[PDB]
Every structure is written in C-alpha cells, then in structure tokens.
Amino acid sequence: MKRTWQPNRRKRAKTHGFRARMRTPGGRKVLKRRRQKGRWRLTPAVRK
Amino acid sequence: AVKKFKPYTPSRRFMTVADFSEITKTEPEKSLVKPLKKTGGRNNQGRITVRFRGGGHKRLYRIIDFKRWDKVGIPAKVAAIEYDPNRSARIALLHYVDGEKRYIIAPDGLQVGQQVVAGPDAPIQVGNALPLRFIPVGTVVHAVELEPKKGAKLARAAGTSAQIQGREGDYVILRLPSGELRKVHGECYATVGAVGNADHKNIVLGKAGRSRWLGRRPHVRGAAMNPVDHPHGGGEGRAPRGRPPASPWGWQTKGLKTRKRRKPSSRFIIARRKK
Amino acid sequence: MTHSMRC
RNA sequence: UGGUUCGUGGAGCCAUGGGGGAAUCUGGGCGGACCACCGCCUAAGGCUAAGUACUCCGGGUGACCGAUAGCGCACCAGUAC
RNA sequence: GAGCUAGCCCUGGCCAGGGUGAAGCUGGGGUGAGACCCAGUGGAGGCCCGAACCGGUGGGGGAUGCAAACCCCUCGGAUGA
RNA sequence: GAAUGCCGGCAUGAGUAACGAUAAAGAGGGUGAGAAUCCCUCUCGCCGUAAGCCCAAGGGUUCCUACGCAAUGGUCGUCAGCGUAGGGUUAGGCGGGACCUAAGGUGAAGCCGAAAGGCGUAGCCGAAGGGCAGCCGGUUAAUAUUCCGGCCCUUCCCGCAGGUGCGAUGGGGGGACGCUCUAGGCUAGGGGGACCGGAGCCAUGGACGAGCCCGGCCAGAAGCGCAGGGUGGGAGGUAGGCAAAUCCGCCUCCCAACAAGCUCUGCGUGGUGGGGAAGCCCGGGUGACAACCCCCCGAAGCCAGGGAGCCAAGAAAAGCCUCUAAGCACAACCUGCGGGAACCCGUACCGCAAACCGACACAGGUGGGCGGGUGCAAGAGCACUCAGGCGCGCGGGAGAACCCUCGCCAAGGAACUCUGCAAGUUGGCCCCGUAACUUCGGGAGAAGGGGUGCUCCCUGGGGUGAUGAGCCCCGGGGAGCCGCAGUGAACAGGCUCUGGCGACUGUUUACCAAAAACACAGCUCUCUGCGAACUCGUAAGAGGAGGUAUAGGGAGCGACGCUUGCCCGGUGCCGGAAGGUCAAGGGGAGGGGUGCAAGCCCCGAACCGAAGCCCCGGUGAACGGCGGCCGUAACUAUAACGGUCCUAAGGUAGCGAAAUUCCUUGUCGGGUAAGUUCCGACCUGCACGAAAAGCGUAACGACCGGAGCGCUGUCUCGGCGAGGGACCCGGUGAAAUUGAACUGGCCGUGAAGAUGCGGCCUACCCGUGGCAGGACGAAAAGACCCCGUGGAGCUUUACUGCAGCC
RNA sequence: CGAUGUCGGCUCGUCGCAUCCUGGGGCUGAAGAAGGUCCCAAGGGUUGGGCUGUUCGCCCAUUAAAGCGGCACGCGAGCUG
RNA sequence: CCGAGGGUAGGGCCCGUGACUGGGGCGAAGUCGUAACAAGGUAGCUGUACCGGAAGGUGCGGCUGGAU
RNA sequence: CGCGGGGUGGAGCAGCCUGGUAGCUCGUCGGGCUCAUAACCCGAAGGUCGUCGGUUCAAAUCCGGCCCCCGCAACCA
C-alpha cells in the first residue's frame, strides 16, 4: 500500500532546507543547536 | 417562469432551472471581467472561518457599476442582458453615448434597446438612477446607496425592491426588502424599479450535487456530532437538544438577538423588520 | 485480535 | 497592581497602568495608618574602576576513572545507523 | 511535522465499448386559436450494463505472513457530490 | 542469583519450519579446481492494454569493458544490480534558466503587536499553465532531436538597400479558455492484393500452383494542390479607455458579406537524402540496381481559436499587433538580404521495478504516452498469438494421513446450519413475450420462452469508387449437412412473493462495524440593514462578500403524500421609560484621632445612583410535559353516561406484542406434516405518537427479516481423482519458549484439580510419522471487577476562575 | 486477576445407575391381551424433522425405546461463533 | 406439415370461503342527552369545512320550503 | 425481612406534620315546587379513623408488630 515516505526533492528543500530554517526564530535555533552539537550536516541532503 | 423536467431520473423529478429567456448575450464583456479568487471560506490565516464552503464552479467576476453618479447626465443604451454567476440578479450591459461600457443590475422589465440615465433630472423611469430626494414618494426603487457616494448597498438580490414612504429633512424613509423602515440620506442614489429575475426564489435545486456546483459543501447537524464538537453532540441513540438549542460555539440560536445595542445606526432605524 | 473477553 | 518578610493586614516604604494635579528652601520626600514634636535626606538627567560570577581555552594537581569504568566518543563520533 | 491522512486553493490529465431515448425542433393531426396526439429527428441524465480507474460486500486462504491489513473467488461506483 | 533488571557471549527448540506466487522444464556443446544454477544451440512452457516500448518522479554510477568470488545473492556460482580497475553522459532548435504570470509566498508604501513577531497595495518570487526556433538517417562496447550526414529554422550584433512619424514598463487589441454532443477533409495505425521484389521449398498421400514463405516505405525547403481556422473596407463626428492619440469604444453614412480578398495552420506533393525482409553463410555480410505500386478500414490524433446544444456561466501575464508622451527625426523603427555572435544546468543507467516507497533482490504501492493480429455483436473485455520479454536465484525423488486450490459423483435435493454460509444454477447476442403497483419516468433484462454451427442457391440497401468491377458494411428468403452438444473453448444475471428501515445517486469508523449511521434536495424556527450577523486573530487584518434580506449565519427536521393536537405554572428567549433590590461614584446628618491653635487626618446615616435580578406579559418546527379512584345500560359482560380528587394541561389524528411488549412462544387467523421466527389481525401500549416529527409511499439497497421455485457435496454420507505442500535424499537453515529434570496410571493427600508426597499398579534403551486430553501449555504484569485521598475524555441549575458579552 | 477463555452447537468418546428399551423376577384391585408397582440387571441400544443462539421445552412422523446425570455446566493449543 | 390432448409459464373474469373489520336493516316496554316539528325556546334547510360521547355546533356563501 | 406510598361516614378527598377541634363535594333520608319526574329550594342523619400493642392525663394524629392495596428498583458480569 502507499507508505508515508514519498520523496520529493523540491518539498524536502523547501520544508527542512537551510533557507527555511534561517527565516524563522525556531529554525535558527535548530541550526544553532546542531552546530553546537557538531553535526556534520545542518540540514537534510537533497540534490536539487 | 422556471422550467421543469420529466422524472427521467430521481433528481429530475424536482429539479427546476431558471428559464434564461431574458438573456440576450451569453459570454461576458472581456474588458469588464476579472478573476474571482475562490476562498473555500478560508481567511488569510488559512483557517476555515465560514464552514461548508468550496468546490463550486469556476467564476469570472463582472465589475458592476454600483455608483452611477459617476456619469451624471450621460445617457446609455441597454445593449444586452446577461447571466452573472456572482449574484442572483441578472445584469445589464450599458453602451454609453460616451463610448464607455458598464454593467448594472438588471431591474425588472428593462428591455434591450432602451435608454437609461443617471442624475437629479432623470425621468422617473425604470433603470434611471436619482438621488433619493428627487424620487417621488411611493416609488419602488432598488440598488440603493446607504450613505451618499458610498455605493448601492440595499436591495440588489433578484426580485427585491425598496419602497419610498416619506421624507424628513435631509432624509427619506424607506421600507427595505426585510420590511424594516429606515431613514436613508436624501443624497443617496437609487434606481427606479425592482430588481429583476423575481422567479429566482422558486428554483428547486433538486439534488445534492446541485448544491455542490454552487460551492456549498454538506452541512452537518450538531446533533450528529460528539460532545467535543458541539453542544448538541453525543448521547446514546438519538437525543433531543437537552438544553437551549445552540450553535457550535455555544450561543443560543432560537431568538437570542444579536444586533449591537449601542449602535449609531439605531438613531435611523424606525421599525425593526417583520415576518 | 486481543484478549478473551471474560466479561 | 507589582516589589519587600509583609497573602489587605493597623499597610507605611519603593515602582507605576488610569484620573486629578503643585511648589523651588519660608520648597519638598522619609522615620510602618494618622497628628504633633523631634530628627534624617534632597525626587522626577547621566557616567563611574576594584573587590563578585562563569569556564569554550591554557596550564597545575588528585586517599578521581582505568575500555560495561571515565565525556556520548581513549579508536576517522555527534560518525555509523 | 499536512512528502501519511482530512479539507480547501491554483494548474493539468483521465473515464474502452455498448444500452435507454428527456426537452427541443420539423412534419402530420387537432381547434376559432389553443391545449394536446402520432411519427421522425434529436441526444438530456448525481440514467442502465461493463474494462481502465476508484472502491472493499460476502466467503475462503494467510496469521513467527509474500504483506505490521496481503492473496483468491465474489461484489459496489464507473459524466460525477 | 533473581529486579518480565542492563550490556554482551552462548545455548534450547532443530538438522526442525522455511528457502517469497503452481508460467515448467529437457538435452547437447562449451568454460572451469568445482557446474541443475554461467555462456552457446535445439526442444518445451509463460506474458503480449504486458510480464513489451517510451516519458516524468524518485534513486544516484546501479551503465560499458577487463580482472575477480571472502562476504552480499534465501541453494549453487565460473554468474551478478557484488569486489577491484579503466572507460562512458557532447544541444542556439529537447527540458530548465538569461521570458510570462497562477494559487501561494515575499513585500519599498502603510498598519499592528511586551520582545520574538503578525499583516500588507504595488513590485518581486513562484509551473507540469502561456510563450518560444529540428526533422529523418548513420555511427559507439557504452551518448546521440546533442557527434556525423542530408534538408530546414530562431534570436542577438554590425553593415548595405528600400520603406516609414520613429519612439513605452503607458492606452487599446489580442493572448483568453467550461461541460456534453459533433460536421467536413486528412494523418497515425491497420486489413487485403490475381500487381511488384526476394534466398529458396515441393516433404508423408496430394500440389510446380493465379502455390508456400518474406517484403512492398521514411523525412523533406520554396512552389503548387486539397481541406480548414482567423479576419469587413471607407468616410464624418466624438465629451469614454485617469496625459496624448491617426489606435480602441460609441453614434451616422457609403460600399462589400452563406462569397471573395488578405493572412495563418494542417495534409498531400515536392529538388534531395534515407531505409530496405525472409532465407543463407561466419552483431555482420549476402539477398539487392531489392521493389517500393493498387484497393479497402480508419481515429479518441490533426486542420482548431471548427460547429451545435446546455447551465453549474467556464485563469493571469508576457511574447505579438496597434496608438501615441517625453524625447528624437545625422536618430529611430519596419521589410529584404549579407557577414558575424549565440552562454549556464540536465542528458549514463533503473524507472509497475531486484536500481523508486515499503528494514529484504518483499505476491503490496507508484502519474503520463504507444500498446500489433484473429475470432467472439462491440471493446483497452476474453482466448490464442506478433514484435519484444520472461520460466519468477534451491533442487532431486516419493505418490501416506492431513491441509490448501481444483474436477466429478448413484438415489435424494436444504433433510445442512444461527443463516442455502459456501458452492451449484442462471449467464452474450437476436426475436417473441412480460404482472401487482406507479410519482406514469418506471417496475423490466420483470417473469417465461424460441433462436445461435456449417454448405449450396436466390435476393434487398448502404460506404468507397464513377452510376460499374473490386474491397467493405448492414440484411432477406429457399434448400441441405454433421455431432451428445453450434455465444461447441475463454469472458458474461439465478428468479419470484412478502415485511422492517432509509426516499433516491452519494458518505463513514486508513487497519475487526458500510449500516437502519452521516450527507442529501425539501420543510420550519431564529439571528443579520451592511464597518451585517457569525467566525479566526491580543491587535492590524481577514473570511462572510467585492455578496446586501429572492442574501448571509445558526438550529432542527429530512424526497414526496396526508398531516403535525392540548399545556406558557418551572427553564430559555422576546417585550415592558412603572415598582422592588442592586456596585463604583455623588452626597455629608452625625461622629472619631491629633495639635495651643489655624489645620491635618479617619469613619460616616438619609438621599441621587446602570446592567442584572425580582416583578408584569408574550412565546413550542423554544427546554419540556401531556392523570387517578369509584359508580352506571331490562341475561351476562362491557360502560356511551355520572361522581369525586389532582394538574400548567391530562396524549388528539394516525399507528400499536412494534428495530418499542416486561408477563410472552399474549390471543386468533395465514403459511408448514410440524412455525419461540415471519405475515395479517385484536388492543390492559410494563414503557408508540405527531419536525429528537406521526402514518404511508412508486423507485432505489453488496442493509436486516420470512417464504416459494430453480439447482446443488450444505447435508443423509461419503467416495475417487488433480496439482502445491506434508514424507524421503542433497544444499542453506530460523522462532517464540526454556529454574533445573533421571518428566508414567489409579486412588488418596496436599494452598482445596500432583510426572515430583503416600499406597498400590504398570513400565527394557533411543527415535520417526501423526492426534491434541494434560503439563492449571505459549503469548500479553486481566480489558471485566474492586482498590489508589492514581490519570485522562466528557457533562451540568457541583465549586471557583478566565475569555467573551452587557 | 505478571489471565484457570466464558453459553450453546459440531466432533470424539468414556463413566455412574436413582433403568427409557431389551433380558430375569415378586406383588397386583394379575381372566387373557395390555398395564400398574417394586426387586435384579449398565451387555448393547436409546431415530429423522418444524421453532428458537438457545440449554430446556412444545410440536410433527416414527420407535423396542425415543432414559437421567458426571467427566472444568467433558471436549475453542479440535472446529464453530 | 397439421393435430385431440398432455406439460411448463404468465395474465384476465366469475363464484364460494376467511381471523378481523365497516357501516346497514330489524327487534313491546334499556342507558344518555333534546337536534328537528310552535319563533321548538339559537328560524330552518343547504354545499363545504373544521370540531365534538351522541344527536349536533360553528365558519363561509346560498334558499324561503322562515315567524312576527 | 430491596425501597416507597396508602387504609378515616355509602363514593372520592381534608384533617396526621404541630396529640385535645373530625371537615369538603356528591350520595342517602324527611319536606317543598311540578299534572308528574329531573333540576332546583328548605331540613336532617350516617365516621368510635385497617388491626393488635406501646407512650401519654388524653392517640385518626406519636412510636413498634401484623393484615391489606397500589408504585419503584433488581446494575457489573
């Protein structure tokens, strides 16, 4: 049957992407925390 | 004269359709239509703020001349009468001797090829617009401005009309379509005659889908819901209201008046409505 | 399913 | 209404959202309602080191751990997944 | 978090084939004129049968599954909300 | 040493289940250390509106080639989507960007909010919509509308020539639009040929034939031909298109009009360039100077912005054209030609799947296009096949029980069972024929029947063509033939009678309920005069609605028919300028503290003083509610009638043992041999009843009840047969569970149901196929139940607050 | 109560005897035939249907008879539901 | 080929019969009330409508076959 | 022996709460009006309060047992 993950590159970049995060106080906290934790990736991978 | 159908489907038993026999032109003036942004009853937050809306036929909005004092003195010819999917009345296309083309609400008995005109000096004649102070007492009038220059606000639905009952200083006394008696400023414009398509109220939609064509999604009774949803929700089996009949939001809905008491227009409402 | 409904 | 030990208390003091609304020392505030007396202090402008706090960083030292412990990671770990 | 699911908005796409035969129109009849009747034409409909497509009615299987909802037979809708 | 403890290691179950669609395999040759599993050949089988082909998502080197086989692959492995290395994606014309706008997003101006932030016109962004110039072939191991070949085309720059009032983010035109049905002419695609081209073949009884088999085209600029779309010309006026306008709009006038003219597509033709089969021989080469023609069928595609009808009334913006403003007319634009210039990103491969979403090479899920042929009425259905692609990554045997899926069955035919559940039956087409009832549509495919193949002969109409032949499409009549049987296989209703419920088509508990539930047209009540009411938001702002009482919100009812009674005392809502009560505030009788005093300070009665409440009325498709006891008629029985008590008023019509009836299988009637169900009645209705509507109702229903016919393996009652498993051999090899075990029966005992205690009995040791009585078997710290001064959802005239409103 | 699945049916039995039938008896208000009642006796047998989920029961047609009870109201790691 | 008739299926007409149900006629001395006949004590009758244990009442319109 | 309500002239209802006082309508009987009946008018009679027992100076009244008669309830399985 149809499952929950239906990959869509435009959707991924526009929802979780760097510029979405930067536009919102909550998004900037996400990046701030992920930098402080040392994440190799701040934002999900999507090829565009 | 509404049209009927032989019972060749269960729904055609009851469906009636407007006869459209007054319509002379069946596509709209391209320079006077604009896109009608459908809303689904959603506001600018995205929230439904008027339940059960959406899904209706696509529509172009026709720009209607609700002022008419725009062009005092300039006779126009009635060029065509057309269908308008954004209102109950029909609309009439005027070709002004100016060259300018405008739409107005089509009053009852207006004919292609006649001439209408707006202003203090306009003949007391169906389709002419005048300031209320110059229309003689007793005249049946429509497309009435509610304050001078703010645009025709009253009696615009198919079949409606307002009757001039008297004068009092700068103000005239109208009997509105509701039966309310109200003071309206003498300098307010109105158009002689009643709105046309008076048979509109006799249409029998006939089937559920026909409501869906109009953008009306199904209405669900509060008594069909659960307590989290509605005052009338819940209960084992069916249930009477069990409390004063209420809206989804809890206010009473059988008689509870809701006009604001301290409203300034109260000084101008002579008699509340009827029936 | 679930349990035997001993009710 | 807040603050203070003060939760309306005899409730002052400091602060102030609303209304009313002064005076320039013979002016004004305070000493826990209020009044007298006796004293203290000068509101509605601003600035000001040091002693104080913290440990990303560096070093020193442990009746601290010693690879299931000690940081989540002694190791290509905020990785693989 | 609405890449699942619910509703709405914008823009596109899809619906084999067959059956029934509404209004209207033409002609004929009818009458003072009408209503109306017959035939032809016409091609309406949350119309009929049935694939795609959308479903999930009954039963059987599956039940550490092929599958954390599937498989087989059967069955509903299929120009419309 | 225990915490269903934590982390890890290793056991048991067990050589057990399983190895992932029952589309299927066999053999020969090759390679190699090794071969059912890799390569080649022949045979066989499966898909073929796909299980073939092409796009788009998504994936991201999985592509090609060489060398590999530890692991991955459910077995094997020499193979591979695996490991190592090298190679591979070529564009002015395809797609996206240097173009346009849509929802929406963002947002100079502006608005709002403690902060963060929320809005917001223009503008900007935003596509699978608008716009815009490339077709056919060849070539690589791997890319090709991209490289190459042939023939075309677009934009930008610069020059030359001719022409012109040139010039725009501004004005206007256009772009520009629905649903259904559909004309003419074409193309795609396909069928046929006695004509053209071709390596060959003659078999096994016959055929050297007007025989079999294969093929018989593709692209193409200007020109021309066919078919279409678009499009009036001229003059005068002019105040409107937010300046101007010679444009457009309006008025008048002349001429032209089912035309024509001009213009724009599509198809055909067209210089030229291509392609080219079977077969044969080793992807190639030959065939081959291959031929490339005639007839038919024919789109849902094309001409297209075509036509008609209908109501639910069907994007924007740019490109483009035209008008003029600043400016400029040494410019500038238009037309023609010439040279030059033309950037960025994608392009491999998979793509209904072993490469995407499902932890797996997972029977699931995934949008668009092509999807051949024959027959079956048609069709994308069904059967078999083309092209093409596969036999599903464990096999070999055996032929037990039992399971699955499937076939048949004597006599009976629902006797099965909660239930005809399941499975039979029926089944397409043509014709004959068809009932109650009905809202006149229907009910209806009602029911029930007859026909269906093949051969010969006669004949009617249409399409193409020419009116004929030929091809093709619809028929009619007559005479025959064969079989058990002619929709001969495959696909393809069982029917009727009668209730309940719901009018109907729809909708729902993704994943135990599809329903009588929700919805639905329609009915009624009620709010709302527009800066509407109502809704979201602190606000701004939005929705409502660019709507205006024939409109919009809320509530209930639920097509339609006939109807919808009595009660306003309580609650609600509506009305009521009196009266009562009522807060802050006003007022200040009279008191109190302090001071020598002027004063300062505090308390404070009468009185004025809103909404709300009380009080007076109204109101039922507002919440709701609609009695009791006793007596009475000339047989009896029963009471039309009376008495009395109570209430705000005592349930009307209609219906009733009912989706409601406890006593109950009420009573009687029907149906049956027999009927706790069903149907029709009666009425002492435990406990119907009129918009939480009452009683009916044609049609409708994968709804629920009852009956009958048809037919059946449901059953009496079971039998046999098929295949996939189960079993055996080779390969690979889990699981929950498990205190340890050397783990029998009875009768007792025991915490009350004992393999484990007592007494007796019985019993050599160890497995394999089976069956499920026990191990109070496994699974899940019982959902029921209770308990906890545990939790959460929900309600209200519980308490207390807050929004909101007054 | 860190679960002893709970009615009825179907299937499969097995046991008790307070015996329904069949066999053996006594007494009889036992003429015969047929019964009544009690004693002994558990070897075997103890039907098919209509109704209801039903157990039970009533009904139909038979029968030698259409027994009553236990086995976790025997039997859901056997099925149904 | 036709064909008595037999069979299957579906209609139409008529007769009889049915729990129960509707009103009708009749029946020496039942119970309720008093509608009509006099102005019958509300003139009556009337078509229709609605209501009520029962006659009846009331509305609308009509008749005189209505009295003084 | 689950929980309520009730028993008083002939019928139907007060009086019980708060102990001393039996009351209302109809009915029944005598008279009147009428030709007669009904209606109507004038008079009158009839209840030791279901029962037994207790408290009290005194019980329909208050308390306990019994009799009778209506109403409610009987849930989780």
Ligand SMILES: [K+]
């Ligand atoms: K319970």
Ligand SMILES: [Mg+2]
């Ligand atoms: Mg889904």
Ligand SMILES: [Mg+2]
């Ligand atoms: Mg998606």
Ligand SMILES: [Mg+2]
């Ligand atoms: Mg994307």
Ligand SMILES: [Mg+2]
């Ligand atoms: Mg995308």
Ligand SMILES: [Mg+2]
């Ligand atoms: Mg997206």
Ligand SMILES: [Mg+2]
């Ligand atoms: Mg976003």
Ligand SMILES: [Mg+2]
């Ligand atoms: Mg982003």
Ligand SMILES: [Mg+2]
């Ligand atoms: Mg911030």
Ligand SMILES: [Mg+2]
């Ligand atoms: Mg990470």
Ligand SMILES: [Mg+2]
């Ligand atoms: Mg890094």
Ligand SMILES: [Mg+2]
């Ligand atoms: Mg992130």
Ligand SMILES: [Mg+2]
């Ligand atoms: Mg109609």
Ligand SMILES: [Mg+2]
């Ligand atoms: Mg009709």
Ligand SMILES: [Mg+2]
């Ligand atoms: Mg009209």
Ligand SMILES: [Mg+2]
């Ligand atoms: Mg426009």
